[model samples]
Target chain A: MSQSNRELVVDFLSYKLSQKGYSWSQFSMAAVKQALREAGDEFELRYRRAFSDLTSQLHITPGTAYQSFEQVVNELFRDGVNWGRIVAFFSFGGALCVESVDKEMQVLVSRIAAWMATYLNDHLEPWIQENGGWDTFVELYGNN
Target chain B: SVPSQKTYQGSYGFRLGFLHSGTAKSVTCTYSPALNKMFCQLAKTCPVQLWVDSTPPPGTRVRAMAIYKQSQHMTEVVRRCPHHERCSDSDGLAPPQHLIRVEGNLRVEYLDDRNTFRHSVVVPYEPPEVGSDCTTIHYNYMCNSSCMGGMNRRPILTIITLEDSSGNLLGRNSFEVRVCACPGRDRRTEEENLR
Candidate 1:
C-alpha cells in the first residue's frame, strides 16, 4: 500500500509538473530524485509490482516519463516558472508521501486545483482581459 | 412625450460593504465613483451612493446577469443634468459618470473570482419634476463581478437601462471590463510580471 501510494503520488506530481509545463529533465534535481526514489521504493513486493505494471501499461519507460518530464521542465524553465515553487509544494516531510487519505485525495486535489486556478485567474485576469492573454496558444497569437 | 429633466446632488456618507464570502476571508469597503464630473471624489457635491461588496474570484469563466430596480431614495438622489456633455477629462483617470436627462440602468457582472471590487457608484440628484407632482421615474442598476484572467484585480460588467414614467423600460447600454496587460491572451507566468 505504501509503495502504491508512493507511485500514485509520483504519478500525480508528474501530472502536475506537466500541467505546469515542467518536463522530467527540466524538473529540479531534488524534485525528480525525490519523486523517483519515493515512488520506486520496493517496500511491499505486491505494491512495487503493481506500480511497475501501471508504469508498463502507460508505456512510461524510465526513458519516456523522464524525457517528457525533462522536456516540460525545460519549457517551464525557459518561461520562468520557478521550479522552486513546484519543489516546495512537495517537500514537507513525507509531503509527497501522503497516503492515509487516498480516497480523500480526490477532494483535496479538486480543492487545490480550484484554489490554484482561482489564484492564477485573480493574478492574471486583469492582464489577460485587456489585450488578451490567458489560455491556449491561439489565445496567445490570435488577433486581439 | 415631454423632454425628461433629471437632477442629482449627492451627499457623501459611509456604509459597510463586503468583498467576498466563504472559504476565503475578505472585507468590504465603500469608495465613491463620482457622477457629473469624472473621477472619484468623496466630497465635491456628493451623488446618491450605492453600496455592494461581493467580487467573484479573479480568473475564471462565469455566467452572469443583472436586474435593476429603483427605490424611492434613488429618485430623491440623482440630480438631472441640465446639458448633455461627454466627460472631457481624459487621462481616462476619471471614473465613469451617469447620464441625467436620458434615463438609463446599469448592471456590472464579471467580477474577478479572486478579488472583490468592494466599491461604490454615486448617483446624485436633480430635485422634483416641477409642474407635475404626479409623474415619477425610478431606476435599478445591478453590477456583477467575476474573473476573466492574468493579474486582473477587478473585472466588472455593466448593464444600463432607462425607464419611462410608468416604470417601463426605455433604453439600455452595456459593456464589460478592459484590463490592460499583454496582448497574447495567454496564461501569465511569474516572469511576465518581472517585465
Candidate 2:
C-alpha cells in the first residue's frame, strides 16, 4: 500500500513535472509527480468529451477559487479518505486546472499542483501517520 | 415447513484471537470496540498460538483462572450480492462501486457446538511457552475490507465464564478474531469468493 500511497502522492504534484507518459517500473518519486500530470491531462481530455454536461455545472472566480476548492475538497473528505475519495480529490484538482485554463486564467494551471501538494503535506499528513505511513502501506500492500 | 440458513456445529465455534501469556489482567488490551480491527490467506493455513497462566485466589488467591485456547481457519464464507440481476442499475457503462469485503464468522451458516463443560484443571503459574504451554492460530489472511482504525490489526478478546466442574464460576476467557487485507494493484484480486 505504501507503493500505492507513493503513487497517489506522486500525482498530487503531477502538473509541476515533465510528462514522459512513461509506464516504466519502480516509478520513484518523480515518476509519481509526472503521472499525476498524466492524470490531469487524461481526465481533462476525458472530461472534455463530457464537458458540456460537466463543465456546465459550475462557475469560478480566479481569486476565490482556491477557497472554493478547499471547501469542496473538505466535503469530499467529510466522511473520510479512501482510494476512491483520494482519486476524487486528484480529479477535482485537475478539473479546476482545466476550467481555470478554459476561463483564460492559465496562470493558475501550474499553481494547482502546488496547492494540491501543500494539502497532501499538511492536511493529509495526520491520516497517513495514524495508518503507519507509506512504509507500512508498502509492507502490507506489497507481495511476499 | 421452512428452509433457513444452515448452522454448523463443531467442537468450538470457528472463533480466533490473540495470545497472551499471563492472566487476562496480564494481557494488554481487551474488548475490541466496534472500531476494533489481520490477514490470513483467503483459504490458506494460518496459525496463531495462544498461551495463558492461571492466577492464585480466594482470600489468598485471585478470582481469575486461565484457560488457553488456539484456533485454525481454512474455509472462508462470503455473502454474495443478492440482487445480481439488477446490479446493472449502474447503467451499461458503470460498474458497482462496492469493494467486496471478505470477512469471517458468518454466523448464518456455522457456529461452534455447545460447550459440554469439557475440561477443568488447577491453576498453574507458567510462562508463555508451547505447553501449559500451547495454542496455534492459523490465519494466512487474504481479506478485502477497510481493515482500518482499531480493527486493522487488533484481535479482540471475548471472555466467557467457565465452571469448575462443580458449577463454581472461575473466570471468563476466549480470544477473539480480527482479520483484514492490504491495498494494492493486484490487491483487489477478484476475491468474490461467494456462492
Candidate 3:
C-alpha cells in the first residue's frame, strides 16, 4: 500500500475519532506502521477504494466504523468473508495488514490473499453483476 | 463439533553460528528460515566460501551469517543470542572468538510429513585463523586475534515458534552453526566445501 493509503487508514481513523468525538489508546500505531511498510506500492490504489467506506464512516467519527472494522476482521476476513462485512474489513485490514513486516506481515498477507481468493471464487458471478456485470475474478481458487 | 482455520505448514528453518573446529567452545548469533530455494542453497553453500575485508587490520578476523525464510522473495531473520546463553570472554586457554563481518544470506525448507527440515546460507568470513594461535574476534569496539579476554565469537541465531489454530505451537525450527574466513570471493574456493 502507498504511504498515502496507509496514512489514510490512520488519518481516517483519527478523523473518525474527532468526528465521533471519541478516543482510544494509541496502541493502533504499531498495527498501522507495521502494515504500511509491507503494503509497498501495488496495493495502494486498490486499498484506497477498499477503505473508502471506512473513511466515510470516520467522517462521522462513529465508533461503529472502527468497531465494525475490528469485529469484521476477526469474524469475516480472519474467520471467513461476509460479502458486506468482509469487504469493509479488507479495505481497512488489507491496508493495515499489508503494511506489516517479517513474520507477522507474511502470515497476514498469506491469510488475506487466501481469503480473498476464496471470497471471489464464491461470489464471482453475483459480484460481477452487483459491480456492473463484470464477470471477472473467476478462475481464482477452486476447492477440491 | 468444530471447524478451524487450516494450519499452513512446510516452511523452512535454519541456524548460523561461529564454531572452532578444534575446540568445542563456540557462540551463535543468528538464525532464520528460507523463504525460497536460493536462500536454502546459500545456507548450504556459503560455508565453503568466506570473505575478508581488506580494510581491517591484518590480525582482524570476520565472518558473516544470514537467517531468513525462503520463498520466491526472501525475508531476513535477525538472530540474537538468548540472555541465558551469554558467556564470558574469560575462559582461559580456549579458542579465540569470531564475529560476523559481512552480512550473509540464509534460508530453510521444512517438510512436516518427514518431520524434518534443512537450511543453507552464505557467509564471507575473514582472518582465516590459519592456526590455533591466530585467533580472530570482534565486538562493537574491540577486535582481537589472540584468544585473550576468554572471548568467544558472539553469534546471532534465529528462532521461530509456529502456532496451530488452537494457539498451540505445533512446530519449531532453528538455523545451523557454521563459520568461515578467507580472502576475496574467489579466494575460498579451496575451503568452500570444507566439512
Candidate 4:
C-alpha cells in the first residue's frame, strides 16, 4: 500500500516514455554499456547474502497492468533524489532486467531502458547538467 | 604505386591524438615527455584515447596496441631518446613475465541517424584498414594495483602502427599514458606494494 523507492520507476517507464524524442532504429545496434551493467551486477553480488534472507523476509510482488508498475515507480522518488540514488535506481532496473529473463518474464526486460531514459530525461538530466553531470560519477567510480 | 606528380598541399608524417571521454571522472596530472607522452599521477583503473594523425595512403592499415610492465622490471631499462618518451614498446618492453596484456574494453563513438551523441557498451578494439579519417579512439583499462603502490599505473606504452597500401609498415610510434585516480581511491587506510 505504501509507495516506496522502487515503485513508480518501473511503471511510468513503459507508459510515459514510450508515450518520443526516442526511437529504436538501426542505431539500436549500439555497444552494450558494460561499466554500469557491471556495477549493477556487483550491486547484487555485494549483497548476494542478505538478498537471500531479505527476499524471504519481505512481501514482494509486481506485474498485471503496466500502469500499476508506473504507479509504483512514481512513488519511488517520493522523498529525495540524486545521482547517488539515481545510479542505484539504474542498478535496480538492470538487476530486474536480468531477473526478468531469469524468470521467463523477458517482456519486462525491454521495458528497462525506457524506464531509465525517462528518469534520465525527466529527473536526472537537469541535476546532472546543473552539476558536473555524469563527469563526477565517471571519475569517482571510474577507478572501480 | 602512384607517387602523385602534383605538389603536395600538406606534409605527410604520422602523429597520435588523445582525447578524454569525459567519463574517466578522475583527477589527472598529465605531462608530455615529448609529444607522444604519458605522465599520469596514475589511477588503479582508467580510460584512454588514441588515433593516428597523418595522411594515409588509400587502403592504409592501422593497428593499436598497449604494452605495460611492472615498474620493478623497468630498472634495467635505458631511456627513450627524449627521456620523456620514457615508456615505449621499443624501449626494452618487459619480458613475458613482466608484461601485462589487457583484453576487451575498446570504445568508439558514431552518430546515429539523428547525429546525437551515443555510447554503447564497451566494444572490442580491432585495427581498422583505412584510418586517416582522424577520428578519436577510446579505451577503459583496468589495473587492480593501488595507486599507493610505487608502481601504481605503470605507463600503458601504447604502440599504434600504420601500414602502407601494400601492408608494409609505414609508420610506428609509441605513446605513453597515465590516468590519476580519485583521491579516495588511493586512500591511506589501504596499502599496496611497488609491483
Candidate 5:
C-alpha cells in the first residue's frame, strides 16, 4: 500500500535512528543543504517555487513557516514513526525551505549530498547490500 | 497517508572515495539510477581514481570498473607568457593550454568468475596531443561477462602513472571497478551497457 507523506517521514527517521549515533541537527543540516544543491544554477527560481508550493499546499503563513517545520519534525520523531516516514519528512522539508529567507532556514542542497556521501561511507552501505540495495530502494521509494 | 509529493525508499546507497598513493579521501558521488552509474569530480591535475564498494574488503576481487578522462576544453589563460605579468594581447586570442606530451605505463588486472587471476594487460601510452590541449585518456576494462558467451569476467583493477620528462612520477591514478545492473532501461541503456 502507498504510504502517506507523514508516514514516509516517520519511516525515514526510524531508519536513521537505527544507526549507532545519528544526530538530528546533522540530519537537518544535510537535508537543507541537499535541497539547495539540487536547485543548482536555477537555485533562486527553484527555491521560490518550492517555497510557494509548500506554503500554499499546507496553508502555512510565511510568519509561521519555522514553527510549522519544527512541528513536523517533532511529529515525525514520535514513537511508532519509521525510517521511510522520516525520509519523507526531510524530503518535504527540503523542498519547502529550498529558498527560505531566514538565515538558518535557507536550504543549501550540496550539504545534503555531502552529508549522505559521508553517511553512506561511515555506515548504512553494508546494510544496503544485505537488504537488496538499489533494487529494493526503488521498489519501496517509488523512484523519487 | 503521505502526500504524493515524492517517493520513499528503504535501501540502496553508495560511497565515493579518491585514493592517492593508497590513502583514501572522500568525495561526493552522484548516482543516476537512470544511468546505473556513479560520477565524482576529478581535478584535471590530481592523480586520483573514484573508488566504490569498500566494504568488500581491501583485496577481494570485484565485478567491473572503468576510468574516463574527461575531454579537454579551452579556458581563458590568465598569464600569457614568461615576459609579461599578464598577457596584454586581447585580440580574442587566449593563450590556450596544451599537453606537451604524455608518456605513461598503464596496467589492468582482474579475476574472472572462476576465481582465477587472469593475465594482466600492461600497455605503454604515448598519445598525441589534441590541438593544443593534452589528449584525454579514456580507458575501460570488463571481464567475466558474455562477449561471444560469458567472457572471462571479474573485479577489475586499474593503475595509471603520469611521469615528467625526468621519468619522475608527477601523478598516479588507480581504481577498483565493479559492475552493477540497473533496475530498468532508459535512454542511456545502450551507452551504459557498452561501458
Candidate 6:
C-alpha cells in the first residue's frame, strides 16, 4: 500500500518515541505508534517510499518556506478532513526543514509544533466529543 | 407633446422620484428606437423626476408608462456624423444626447470544439420593445471531444462588442471560460469487454 507522506512521518516519529519506552498517557505519540504497530512491517517499507516521494514534491527554499507553512495550515477548513492528517502534514515539513539546516530553510520546527499544539487545544479539542472523541478516533483510525 | 412643455431635463439620464414619498420602489426602463422614445414601467405608482441644471426638481405622479422622447434631429446628426465628429460638437442637432442603447442580448457560439472559442459565432441582437419589463438574455454553448483534442482542460475566450446604429463600436468586454476535462469511459472495463 502507498502510504501518504503524512502517515509515514507520524508513524516513524511514533516508533522512535516508543523505542524509548514512552507511556500510553502521551496519547498523541502513543496513538500514532499503536496505529503503525498494527500496520505491520509493510507500513515501514511504505513509509520509506512515501518519504522519498515527499522529499521530491517539497521544493523548500529559504525565501518561501515560511509562506508555504502558513499556506498549508490555512487549507485545513474543509469538511471530512481529519485534524490528525494536518498534524502529520506539518510534521513531515518540520522533518525536511530540520534535515536541510545547511540549505538555511527558514521553517522553524518549534513554530510548527507550537502552531500544531495551539490548533489542537483551541480548535480540534473543542469539538472532539462530537467527532467520537480522541479515544474513539484512535480506535477506529489507529490499530485494527 | 407640446414644444414648450417638452423638457430637455433628461438630456443625459432620467431622474426619478416616488409617488407615496416613503421610499422609491424599483422600475424598468425600455427604449424603442423605431418610436424614438423610452418608456419607464413601475412596480408601484410613483412620481418620475427629470433633471434641470443637474438638479432634481419635484416630479409629477406617474403610473403605467412614462414617455421620454429621443430627439429626431440628434438621431439624424448621429447617422451622418462619425464618432469623433459627434463628440467634437459639429453642426447638426446637438449630436446624439446619448450613445445608442443596447437593449437586446449578446451571444457567442463556438464554431468548433477543441475546448476553444478561437473560431466562434456572434449572434445578432434583437430590437428593443417599448414598456417591456426586464428580461434575461442567455448565451448557450457546448464543448466536446470532436474539438477538444487530447487536452484535459483549456480556457475559452468570449468577447461582446456593443455598436451604435451607425456601425461605430461603442464598448466591448472580454472574459474567459475555463473548460475542464470531460469524463471518459473506464479503460479497464473496455479492455475486459474486448477480450
Candidate 1 docking category?
Answer: incorrect
Model 5 chain B is weakest, by summed lDDT over 10 consecutive residues, at: B73-82
Candidate 3: global Cα-lDDT? Answer: 0.27
Question: What tens digits encode model 5's per-residue C-alpha lDDT throughout A59-81?
Answer: 32222333454454454556323
Candidate 2: deviation at residue B63, Å? 96
For each candidate in turn, the TM-score is 0.18, 0.28, 0.19, 0.30, 0.18, 0.26
**lDDT (CA) per prediction:** 0.25, 0.32, 0.27, 0.36, 0.28, 0.30
DockQ of each two-chain model: 0.02, 0.02, 0.01, 0.02, 0.01, 0.01
Give the chain B TM-score for each candidate: 0.20, 0.25, 0.19, 0.38, 0.25, 0.27
Question: Could you tell which candidate, 5 or 6, scores higher by lDDT?
Answer: 6
Candidate 2 Cα deviation (angstroms), residue A114: 4.8
RMSD (Å) per prediction: 23.4, 21.3, 23.1, 21.0, 24.0, 25.5
Error of 4 at B78 (Å): 21
Q: Using lDDT as the measure, what is the rank order of every candidate, best first?
A: 4, 2, 6, 5, 3, 1
lDDT of 2 at B119: 18
Worst 10 residues of 2 chain B by lDDT: B60-69
The candidate maximizing lDDT is 4
- Per-residue lDDT tens digits of candidate 3, residues B32-106? 222111111111122222121122233221222233323321232222211101222212321112122212222
Q: Kindly list the per-residue Cα lDDT of model 3 for residues A1-144, writing each as its tens digit.
A: 123333443443333223211112122323433333333233334443312343343221112223333443455435442334433453455443322111121333344444544544455334444562211112121111
